[PDB]
């Protein structure tokens, strides 16, 4: 589509898209510009595919962790808020949408997972993960269960995996080390082992997912769930009297959720960038605009200071921010999707008994490190001129060890297939050393010097 004089917006289907459509109708009334809100499945995987063809929505909403990869691939317009508009939003929310020094999206709202609990079944929720088996043994006798939440998406199990030490990529000196992946350390093993023990002891079912847990909680069948602010609307409509509180500790350490900033990026290919700017700054990021969305599904702690001051008086929002401060803002680097895919497979395989915890997590660390390295090496090879990539292949065609890389394999391979061949054949660490040295040899000392700086700590 991408037609001029219309805005198309994509937002995930668990968000308040009917409220956002109401903000779109006000824009249309005031300006004559139609706004279409859609919620495609897997919108966050479809956006990079269609935007790289010059198509897609004008505006895309997702948590900020996806946006670095979109920006690195050139799919997002840099946004240009004036100083006066920037002062309307909290400074840490602007940081979450900064990539390579540029603002690449409008931050909307700060999301963190909380422990949600049914006050009639459980007037005093647990402070610890460790007491949840004893607490479930009690509720079973009453015909209930202690805790159901989505085990299919690692976003929901990460708080526990990280509590005693798990991490995605090691952070220091303001930069993330994509070679130092923390999904296989002692603390991650301990958290996932606890989760799987909960399943093997029949306190949880490995196949619980979002809709199952949400239904069970909102029907009064389970005393607790783990969810974000978007889920409160549906509990409000049910008969459940709930509270929202800090996640349980594990081995005495806070559960550490990955905090998302819901963010609106502008497609690089859109011919409507100025209208999208006007819609986001003057209609959405206002008291009325955010109230319209929030009434549909709550946003969490919004980035807009004037509205957030009213929301911050809600103890549910107090709890959301308490959990946020116990966790960490997600990285936005392009390698975050590699981390998430690897962890997702590990948690599903351990929970279903397909693999042990130790083997699931050992494979997740290898998979994440390999995919992260592929991402970086691809990006660098894409910076070679086509004539320099040809010289590169001749250099690597002579690289020894069991067998070499045959000429026909490289002959018509582009930068991504070349990155894959090198990594498949040499492993991530050697693939990168060979490519770095080859950049020096074919006289791209700019790539050589910048690549050297990647691994310095
Ligand atoms: O094939 C496996 C699955 O692939 C797809 O899911 C991927 C995503 O494409 C990745 O982006 C990532 O997802 C992260 C996500 O980026 C991160 O923001 C967080 O998502 C929260 C969201 O912030 C929050 O607002 C609310 O919507 O809940 C989301 C979690 O459900 O965490 C996600 C990780 O859990 O990783 C997954 C792979 O796990 C695809 O969409 C799936 O349909 C597919 O099965």
Residue numbers in the entry: 2 to 402, 405 to 460
Please, what does the article write about this entry?
MBP is one of the most commonly used protein expression tags due to its exceptional performance in enhancing the solubility of the target proteins. The death domain superfamily is a structural motif found in many proteins that are involved in physiological, as well as pathological processes. To explore broader crystallization space, we designed a series of protein expression vectors V28E1-V28E6 containing helical linkers of different lengths.
